[PDB]
């Protein structure tokens, strides 16, 4: 029930859930992630489907502290990226984003 602001486990945390870019469907998408010196051989990128399927993603070599993931986020629902480093979810992980088809230009 309700608490008197004395200190109790959380129930529902309010957030934004907004992406810095738009994700498309059936097309290569470049995902930029601010990663430190950490390398890829140590990291692991895998996209999870709302059906229970797990895929693999490639981390193209950008720079010393830069990395890019190119993959085709195509599912029947919501897409969720699982980026863990040595068995630990990084900041903003897993990453959830909604996909949509490309209609007109503008």
Go through the domains of the chain in sequence order and give each one's CATH number: 22-101 (2.60.40.10)
Q: Is residue 102 helix, strand or coil?
A: coil
Task: Return the structure tokens found at 78.
Answer: 């919501």
59, 47 contact by CB (below 8 A)? no
88, 38 contact by CB (below 8 A)? no
Distance CA 51, CA 73 (A): 13
φ, ψ of residue 46 to 5 degrees: the values are: -145, 130
Instruction: Say which experimental method was used.
Output: NMR
The per-residue DSSP string of 29-84 comes to EEEEE---S--TTTEEEEEEPTTS-B---EEEE--SS-EEEEE----SS-EEEEEE
Using alpha carbons only, what angle is made at residue 105 by residues 103 and 106, rounded to the nearest 5 degrees?
120
Task: Return the structure tokens found at 67.
Answer: 């990395």
Distance CA 40, CA 58 (A): 9
């Amino acid at each position: 029930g309700s608490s008197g602001s004395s200190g109790r486990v959380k129930e529902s945390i309010t957030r934004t859930s907004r992406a810095p870019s738009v994700a498309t469907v059936g097309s290569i998408c470049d995902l930029n992630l601010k990663i430190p010196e950490i390398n890829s051989s140590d990291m692991s990128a895998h996209v999870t489907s709302p059906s229970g399927r797990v895929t693999e993603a490639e981390i193209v070599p950008m720079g010393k502290n830069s990395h890019c993931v190119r993959f085709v986020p195509q599912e029947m629902g919501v897409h969720t990226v699982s980026v863990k480093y040595r068995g630990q979810h990084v900041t903003g992980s897993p990453f959830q984003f909604t996909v949509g088809p490309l209609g007109e230009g503008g």
